[PDB]
Amino acid sequence: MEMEKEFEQIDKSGSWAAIYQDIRHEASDFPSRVAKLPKNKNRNRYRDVSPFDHSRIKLHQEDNDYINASLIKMEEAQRSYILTQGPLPNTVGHFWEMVWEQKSRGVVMLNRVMEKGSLKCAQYWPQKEEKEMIFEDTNLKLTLISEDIKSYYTVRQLELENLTTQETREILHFHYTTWPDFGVPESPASFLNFLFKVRESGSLSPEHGPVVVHCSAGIGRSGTFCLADTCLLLMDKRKDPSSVDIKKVLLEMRKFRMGLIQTADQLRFSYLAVIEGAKFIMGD
Numbered sequence: 001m002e003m004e005k006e007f008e009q010i011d012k013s014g015s016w017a018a019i020y021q022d023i024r025h026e027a028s029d030f031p032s033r034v035a036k037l038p039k040n041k042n043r044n045r046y047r048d049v050s051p052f053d054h055s056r057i058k059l060h061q062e063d064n065d066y067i068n069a070s071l072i073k074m075e076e077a078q079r080s081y082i083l084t085q086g087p088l089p090n091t092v093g094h095f096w097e098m099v100w101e102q103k104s105r106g107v108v109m110l111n112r113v114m115e116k117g118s119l120k121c122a123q124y125w126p127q128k129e130e131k132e133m134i135f136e137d138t139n140l141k142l143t144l145i146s147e148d149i150k151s152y153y154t155v156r157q158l159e160l161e162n163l164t165t166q167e168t169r170e171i172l173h174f175h176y177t178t179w180p181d182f183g184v185p186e187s188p189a190s191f192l193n194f195l196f197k198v199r200e201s202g203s204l205s206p207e208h209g210p211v212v213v214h215c216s217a218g219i220g221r222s223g224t225f226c227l228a229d230t231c232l233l234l235m236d237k238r239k240d241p242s243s244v245d246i247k248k249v250l251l252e253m254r255k256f257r258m259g260l261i262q263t264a265d266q267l268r269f270s271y272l273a274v275i276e277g278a279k280f281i282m283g284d
């Protein structure tokens, strides 16, 4: 079926939970043996969210190459994404090593450091220009260059230096700051505006390594971001945009990381975002 009318048909019939459970039943199951080794317990935020072995990002280190991060490679859309958990106190240096080694330009953050009164990720970037951060375990230096605070998101320019080689690179930090503590946003308008700002920066383009996107577990809000992006790109590429099947795209993405899209409300929000976004792209 088309998307917008399949949407109204699920709303009127109140079957979002049944649609979402079908996706969970059909989703791929692949081994995640490296994630579960005992030496990696303090590298995982949640015991039930692990990267598959076949798609995990490897650190370029001979001691321990493990990080809870997955490469989602979308062949028809010609987009790649790295989805990862919010960094932990003992993985902030691994996080920036990955950014460096994979040649990423941008980092997309969809959570606040504290939500619901608890810490959802480490404070992994510097908050003042004159107070840079050094990560001694991976030999990197990170400096805040500039910061632009808007009503729904903040954009930061950062400098990452490889202290071994003295090479430097500019990284863009795109921080969506207004996702609610419970539920999903009422309108997708600010999320789409944010997605378009990431696109306009070049961070999603083939001349750079894959964008790094995270929330707390790296599957829920993060899944919504890449699913909406890929679906809109396919609608631009194809002769028949109504052929884009959001449930099939989600199942394809779940071959590369488990659990993408965590609730039936997130599934409904993804439909809403793609539907509204397809109108703004055009033509009109």
Ligand SMILES: O=C(O)c1cc(Cl)nc(Cl)c1
Pocket: 076, 238, 239, 240, 243
């Ligand atoms: O390239 C394709 O796979 C494809 C598939 C569908 Cl269903 N529609 C178009 Cl236009 C292209």
